[PDB]
Symmetry: C2
Subunit: 114 residues, 2 copies
């Protein structure tokens, strides 16, 4: 059994053609997980995970702030205390239009990697 403060996990900065202003913590990864992995994303002000899709689902819980969710067309903002279920193959992404960091938990089946 592993009991740990999520903040103490070292975040990974992401800056690519499709993801900018985002840090990722792998809390429960491939080393431990028999079936699915647990990540915590921090989206800086102005940060973006552009529209994408994959053959696996997301299960998300918004921990802090106002998260903008990009849909195949349009977008929807949600707050801390929302959960999000993204079906396999659905186009989605994320943006932070606020002036403070947004945090969300994100779980995927292990075929999606960590």
């Amino acid at each position: 059994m592993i009991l740990k403060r999520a903040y103490d996990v070292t975040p990974q900065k992401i800056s690519t053609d499709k993801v900018r202003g985002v840090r990722k913590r792998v809390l429960i990864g491939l080393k431990d997980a028999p079936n699915f992995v647990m990540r915590l994303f921090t989206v800086e002000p102005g940060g973006l995970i552009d529209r994408h899709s994959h053959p696996w689902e997301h299960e998300i819980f918004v921990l802090k702030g106002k998260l903008t969710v990009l849909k195949e067309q349009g977008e929807e903002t949600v707050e801390e205390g929302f959960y999000i279920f993204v079906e396999p193959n659905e186009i989605h992404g994320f943006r932070n239009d606020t002036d403070s960091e947004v945090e969300f938990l994100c779980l995927i089946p292990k075929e999606g990697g960590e």
Copy 2:
């Protein structure tokens, strides 16, 4: 399977009472349940003050994230308290339980592979 995305305030789910031989003072919200989940389920547990999930084990893992309060985690040997912002991984078959020794509600997210139910 189906397409789309669900976006919903977790508290829009009513907290249902859990009452078994080994659980008292606990309510549960099924967020992403069997009816929808391809692989694993997402629940939000509320432990009332003095509530207890006694030591148990099962042939699936838990992945937990503490959302609110101070959660006492029962281990095969002793116990350890964690707080909001801690995660917990429980291996399959590991002895574990939970207790709320405080005077306020403790809340945690708990995900299991869907073969273990919701």
